Amino acid sequence: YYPFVRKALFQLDPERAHEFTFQQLRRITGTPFEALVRQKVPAKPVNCMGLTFKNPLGLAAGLDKDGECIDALGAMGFGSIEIGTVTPRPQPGNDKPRLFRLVDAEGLINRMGFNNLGVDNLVENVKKAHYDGVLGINIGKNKDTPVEQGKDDYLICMEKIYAYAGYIAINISSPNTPGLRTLQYGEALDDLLTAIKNKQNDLQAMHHKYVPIAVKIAPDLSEEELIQVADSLVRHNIDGVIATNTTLDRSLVQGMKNCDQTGGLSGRPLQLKSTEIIRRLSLELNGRLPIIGVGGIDSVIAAREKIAAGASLVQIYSGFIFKGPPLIKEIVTHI
Amino acid sequence: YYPFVRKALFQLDPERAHEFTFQQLRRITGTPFEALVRQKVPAKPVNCMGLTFKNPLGLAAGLDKDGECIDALGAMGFGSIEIGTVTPRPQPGNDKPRLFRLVDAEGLINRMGFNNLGVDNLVENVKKAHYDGVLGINIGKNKDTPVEQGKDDYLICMEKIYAYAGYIAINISSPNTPGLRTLQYGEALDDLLTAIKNKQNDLQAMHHKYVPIAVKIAPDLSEEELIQVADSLVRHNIDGVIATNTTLDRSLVQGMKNCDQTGGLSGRPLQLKSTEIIRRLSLELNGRLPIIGVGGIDSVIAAREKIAAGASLVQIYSGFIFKGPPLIKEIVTHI
Numbered sequence A, B: 001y002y003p004f005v006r007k008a009l010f011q012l013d014p015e016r017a018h019e020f021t022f023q024q025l026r027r028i029t030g031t032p033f034e035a036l037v038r039q040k041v042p043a044k045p046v047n048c049m050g051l052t053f054k055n056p057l058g059l060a061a062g063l064d065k066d067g068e069c070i071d072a073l074g075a076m077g078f079g080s081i082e083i084g085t086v087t088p089r090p091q092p093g094n095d096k097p098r099l100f101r102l103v104d105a106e107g108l109i110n111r112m113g114f115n116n117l118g119v120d121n122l123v124e125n126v127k128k129a130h131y132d133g134v135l136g137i138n139i140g141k142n143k144d145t146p147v148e149q150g151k152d153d154y155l156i157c158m159e160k161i162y163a164y165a166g167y168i169a170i171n172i173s174s175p176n177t178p179g180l181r182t183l184q185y186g187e188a189l190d191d192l193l194t195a196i197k198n199k200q201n202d203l204q205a206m207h208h209k210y211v212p213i214a215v216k217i218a219p220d221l222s223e224e225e226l227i228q229v230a231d232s233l234v235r236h237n238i239d240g241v242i243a244t245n246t247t248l249d250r251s252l253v254q255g256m257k258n259c260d261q262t263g264g265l266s267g268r269p270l271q272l273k274s275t276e277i278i279r280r281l282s283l284e285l286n287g288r289l290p291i292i293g294v295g296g297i298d299s300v301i302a303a304r305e306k307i308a309a310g311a312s313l314v315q316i317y318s319g320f321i322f323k324g325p326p327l328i329k330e331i332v333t334h335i
């Protein structure tokens, strides 16, 4: 039962608990010892972005940032796994402590800052995996890269992962790399998307492989901001949009431990906002391109709320922490 | 641990689980066995409709229709308890099976139809209770009473319960008595509200105290209908609005067992609709009378989402069935 494992894990500091569990997952992933974490879940194929997803539930980015546990996590039943965020060069992220639990609110605050081993390392791990689901690779900009030259970072990552990725995710919604969210505003977004779309075509002719590209947005976008962001995605024929990353909002966690920590709020306190963001976005997009819904999904009803607001697929992260593998089985079985 | 209790009770059909549970509650009342139900909760006093509530969390109507376990349920930490619905004359309600569990959705469907022992009996039960929180007494129309004369029934009950109620809840939102929901439309509502306020006025003069009246509305109302209901509640000086009852919607429960069962849906499948109803009603009311929020509250954040949409108090029914007494402590502690 996950309640017992969680009580134990929750004795440990958030980031420490993660490093221990993933040490253990590393040592079993891709080995017959993944029967320890294997869950049988039904098939629920979904066509999306020109790919078949074996089921509608993906693991959102940030949990396996370096691509170390693809097979073990696939063994728990995810229909897609989004690894990353990976930056062209490794970088340590922001100073610890940078990860905080809000246990009563079943939410998380984090200011990781893209802590990853770099895109070259990620490709080596992906080469070793045998996951039959859809693999998405999330990419972002090195901390030290000028925001006016962010495109250059997204394009080197694209060249190195194109051959091994089912889909590519463009993270421009972390609040933990300064200025990064500006890349979703006006001319900056247009230039970045034009570069990404041109490289995707180039790469498609090079490797002879269709790889869709989806942009991950933030939930703190204003209505005019959202409107402009939807229009740009359609105008540049982006293949899909991942809505939504973490929030700088703290309106539902006041008076709670760690609510004043800086960073992104995830989990149940993000659920409602992300659903409203997807509704509004779906109304603007009008079926022109699909949405992958992410934001406090912690039950099959919450997953279905995102479907009803317009999402074609869904991803979970914080609900996996607070409810465990069983959430995967619940959501895949009944969505 | 409630999960064990739930697994046992869920071996019974929902109506039998309930009456088996309530037999044991009536039996442990006033014995040292009442401590198995007793839960110490933090005091969070809140003033609303001119009453002081122990804490913001109440038990919604329909769990104790005859007022038989006021003491045992109070001991569990509720800051208020709403009994009913009760009708002037006893009536059996609709045919069994009339109550259904949707376990993976943590929802319920019911078509009880105001099965109750009558207002005189509830009054005798209230006289024997010792609860020190706010007692709400929820009243309704007998099935046989014609819809156009529904007000007669509300007035008969108001007279028999005025000396005993902390507040009175007028139920015009059950989907399970034919035409009852038309009493929240147009002239019917205006007529009902006038007769009720005049009875209130007469009864204050007779008993020398003001007992506030709250009207319970439905989540299936349109925007225009909700604007009219709010305007009528303000023009008639109603002391509060209870939003929201069960839903005829099945959009989030498709493909699930008991989903085609006729009646009202409660639980997690109603949460979002209830919240959106409260937000809209709150804009229309602009603070002129309080909202008691109800519908799918199963967590501290879900209760807080209702407060944010404009409610002053919240109530739970289905979440108490699915998550148990620990939910009372969780919400009252961190709301």
Ligand SMILES: Cc1cc2nc3c(=O)[nH]c(=O)nc-3n(C[C@H](O)[C@H](O)[C@H](O)COP(=O)(O)O)c2cc1C
Pocket: B060, B061, B062, B063, B065, B084, B085, B099, B108, B109, B110, B112, B114, B138, B171, B216, B244, B245, B246, B265, B266, B267, B268, B270, B294, B295, B296, B297, B315, B316, B317, B318, B319
């Ligand atoms: C079995 C059952 C019986 C109910 N009986 C009543 C009732 O008699 N009067 C009333 O006003 N509401 C009644 N309700 C509705 C609840 O009081 C509440 O308004 C609705 O269920 C939404 O709350 P919830 O999602 O927390 O259960 C009943 C609900 C259920 C599930």
Ligand SMILES: CCCCCCCc1cc(O)c2ccccc2[n+]1[O-]
Pocket: A009, A010, A014, A015, A017, A018, A021, A022, A063, A099, A101, A108, A320, A321, A324, A325
């Ligand atoms: C091994 C079954 C799945 C559980 C993985 C738990 C590892 C884990 C545990 C936590 O408490 C975390 C808190 C915040 C962010 C991430 C966390 N992770 O990744």
Ligand SMILES: CCCCCCCc1cc(O)c2ccccc2[n+]1[O-]
Pocket: B009, B010, B013, B014, B015, B017, B018, B021, B063, B099, B108, B320, B321, B324, B325
């Ligand atoms: C003492 C535990 C608190 C929960 C009460 C359990 C009894 C109980 C169990 C159920 O499965 C029900 C299903 C629908 C409606 C009411 C129900 N009740 O009242």
Ligand SMILES: O=C(O)c1cc(=O)[nH]c(=O)[nH]1
Pocket: A062, A085, A110, A111, A112, A113, A114, A115, A171, A173, A174, A175, A176, A177, A245, A246, A264
């Ligand atoms: O790693 C991070 O800092 C990070 C990236 C991202 O996209 N979202 C987030 O909340 N944190």
Ligand SMILES: O=C(O)c1cc(=O)[nH]c(=O)[nH]1
Pocket: B062, B085, B110, B111, B112, B113, B114, B115, B171, B173, B174, B175, B176, B177, B245, B246, B264
């Ligand atoms: O008893 C019922 O049928 C009933 C009454 C009411 O007010 N609401 C509801 O959902 N059911």
